A paper describes a structure:
We recently discovered that FEM1B, a substrate receptor of Cullin 2-RING ligase (CRL2), recognizes C-degrons containing a C-terminal proline. By solving several cryo-EM structures of CRL2FEM1B bound to different C-degrons, we elucidate the dimeric assembly of the complex. Furthermore, we reveal distinct dimerization states of unmodified and neddylated CRL2FEM1B to uncover the NEDD8-mediated activation mechanism of CRL2FEM1B. Our research also indicates that, FEM1B utilizes a bipartite mechanism to recognize both the C-terminal proline and an upstream aromatic residue within the substrate.
Unexpectedly, unmodified CRL2FEM1B adopts two different dimerization states, with one symmetric and the other asymmetric. Hereafter, the symmetric dimer is referred to as dimers, and the asymmetric dimer is designated as dimera. The C-terminal hydrophobic patch of FEM1B.p1 in turn associates with RBX1.p2 to seal the ring, with Ile546, Phe549, and Leu550 of FEM1B.p1 forming hydrophobic interactions with Trp35, Ile37, Ile49, Met50, and Trp72 of RBX1.p2. RBX1.p2 associates with the WHB domain of CUL2.p2, which characterizes an autoinhibitory state for unmodified CRL2. In contrast to RBX1.p2, RBX1.p1 does not contact the WHB domain of CUL2.p1 but associates with the middle region of CUL2.p2, providing additional interprotomer interactions. In the dimera structure, the CUL2.p2 WHB domain interacts with RBX1.p2, with Lys689 forming electrostatic interactions with RBX1.p2 Glu55; the CUL2.p1 WHB domain associates with CUL2.p2, with Lys689 forming hydrogen bonds with Gly360 and Gln362 of CUL2.p2. Therefore, Lys689 neddylation disrupts the assembly of the dimera by introducing potential steric clashes.
Numbering used by the authors:
A (entry chain E): 21 to 106
B (entry chain B): 246 to 744
C (entry chain A): 163 to 412
Write the structure that this text describes.
Amino acid sequence: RFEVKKWNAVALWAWDIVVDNCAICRNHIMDLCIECQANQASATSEECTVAWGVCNHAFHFHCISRWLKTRQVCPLDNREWEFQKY
Amino acid sequence: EEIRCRKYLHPSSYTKVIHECQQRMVADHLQFLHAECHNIIRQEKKNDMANMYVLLRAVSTGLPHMIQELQNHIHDEGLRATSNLTQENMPTLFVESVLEVHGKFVQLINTVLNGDQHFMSALDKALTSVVNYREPKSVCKAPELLAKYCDNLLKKSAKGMTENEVEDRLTSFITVFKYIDDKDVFQKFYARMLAKRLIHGLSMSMDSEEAMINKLKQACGYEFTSKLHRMYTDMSVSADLNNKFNNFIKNQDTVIDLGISFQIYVLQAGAWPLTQAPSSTFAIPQELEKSVQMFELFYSQHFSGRKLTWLHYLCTGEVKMNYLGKPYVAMVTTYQMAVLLAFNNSETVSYKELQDSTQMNEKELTKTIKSLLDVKMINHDSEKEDIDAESSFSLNMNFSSKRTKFKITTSMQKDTPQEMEQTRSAVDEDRKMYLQAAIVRIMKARKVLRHNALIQEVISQSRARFNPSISMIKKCIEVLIDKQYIERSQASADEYSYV
Amino acid sequence: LLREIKNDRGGEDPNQKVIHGVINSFVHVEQYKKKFPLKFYQEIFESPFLTETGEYYKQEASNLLQESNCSQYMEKVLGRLKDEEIRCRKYLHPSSYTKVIHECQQRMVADHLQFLHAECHNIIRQEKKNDMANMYVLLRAVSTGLPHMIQELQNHIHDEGLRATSNLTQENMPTLFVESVLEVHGKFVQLINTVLNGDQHFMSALDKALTSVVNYREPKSVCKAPELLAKYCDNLLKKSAKGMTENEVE
Ligand SMILES: [Zn+2]
Ligand SMILES: [Zn+2]
Ligand SMILES: [Zn+2]
């Protein structure tokens, strides 16, 4: 029996932005959000509007709302978030 | 004569009398002064050199010969003070000797030679020729020795070096570093040693590393140390990231129970010299696979748009060995920890079971068995201890080291010549990229130049970074030909055109 | 004649002198015609050839998308485009040099703009310097190819610039802000010069993207760029006790 106590690890983070994709869910923006992907029967498939910042970054409204409930900063570029469209 | 023309003549003829008293008394006999200048400089006689300098400065065109003689003397002094270095301690004593020469000759110029800026320029050119003493067509040992010097004096060592001594030593060292004219090589080498020292925890203090990065930034610029400062910033924010991950796993629904003291070192990909060059697919053990999954969930939740490339050759951790009575806890790389867990899977294990349990390539695997057997952690049950087709080997019961925290890895220095050549090739590629940028910028600005003027302007533009060669430049024109961006002129091959 | 040029496209090397000699006949017969000395050549051979090279490179481009991704598809297209420049040079009249290449482009790169433009985002964002110099020279020839790379580079510089000038330390914000733009400006001037031919349509894409990051304003606030660049002048034009020599200031 060998028991591992520590696993001090090194990982490289790199940007993985793909075209027309919600960065929080890693899925397409026109599709439903991953928070609304579950219980799809209850969801009306209409409230997952695409929210655009003034930095021209598009997420879903629910995902950016849940993001702003923790931090007021855009994930893809570390600047504050201003809605401009819906 | 000055006091005489002051007490006899008009104020308007003070200079003209002195000018004719010098242009016909120490400028008509200028050949004798210039002939004795070499000897009076090489002997280093203080008052005689001071009077010689005053007289030559009085002459309109009598000083530059003294500049050349002094520069040659400094070049010879630096060459005789840097070519006798041994391999016992080269990075320290090389920079120490260059500092001694520079300080002594700055004192000589400032004290008994008026501190002329032309003489300082000559000293700078002479030391530039000294430290860049290229052994003919083989190497340039200056940037590697400077990087090794920084690594040696910034590494956490038990020899004894206080913070203030290190800081003033680096402040002195920057004067040596200011004239290397191969700073790309030093940048890559310092990035490699900084990566090793930050990851393996060999830094004596983060303040020392930040101060050294600030010194290099003030020496060259923000573009020189942008990557180094991003490395330091990631290493400083690593603690906040670990705290945030622990808060994340404490605030989940169920008890995750990682079972290991996970401590991640998430690094920015573009700013670090690290890469996934060992492209072998590594099978993470299950107890580490749970932690990998949970940190992937965290780094996909609290950070968005970032893919997390895992490095399995910069990872290390403590493993316990309570199977044989728990003698100690071993620090070990994850490559070797995988085969230790495979040993846990079955006492009798072969190479095929290792291959199907780790999925990793044969060279890194064989390196792991070698680095386990040389520390007598394991014994080979076959007739011969080296690699073979079968390779069946079990745990060694005779390991009785006296350390309760014995470490079986020592790959903190490395610096194998293969990766040294890989680093130099990366420098060469970056040099080629910069030369292509300069060539395209100059052509877009002017569209008509000759070969020699192009070479001279490339040297002038890239003087602060490196010393480019003709073959590399012509390779850059060849690459732009292959990309159909450049063309030589139809009238003459000397001139150049645009596609 | 089309068969032994199509066979040349398949790899084999036929008689170059015979093919060029027969092709030269359709234009050397008409040497005594004062008006339209190439009307025979442009209908007997060139019009069938431009149709033949149209239905062949349409078949070849569709044959390359099946077993090649966008990274090595452009290596193959540039290999065919460079070969076709050589191949038509030694076979056809110099008048039909441009028509064959331009019709080759309209079957490989122009018919597959949507495939190249969809992958143009990953080429710019990941900074593939080899693939960006291929997507350029393919889309430079097409009239409507560049205006999507120009947008994707401007979106990349704006996102790279905004990320670089983000969460600067309050201690050295006037100096960190200027040097963060200059490293983004310095990186992308060189990237455009080395890779994208130093194109002015892309330098304007950089200037239109660096203007947005410099003039980026916090919510319910005002742009702090004029204030930060006023302090950067002030910080280094004072009597600097520590370093900052005369040659460095200028
Ligand atoms: Zn979403
Ligand atoms: Zn939703
Ligand atoms: Zn954003």
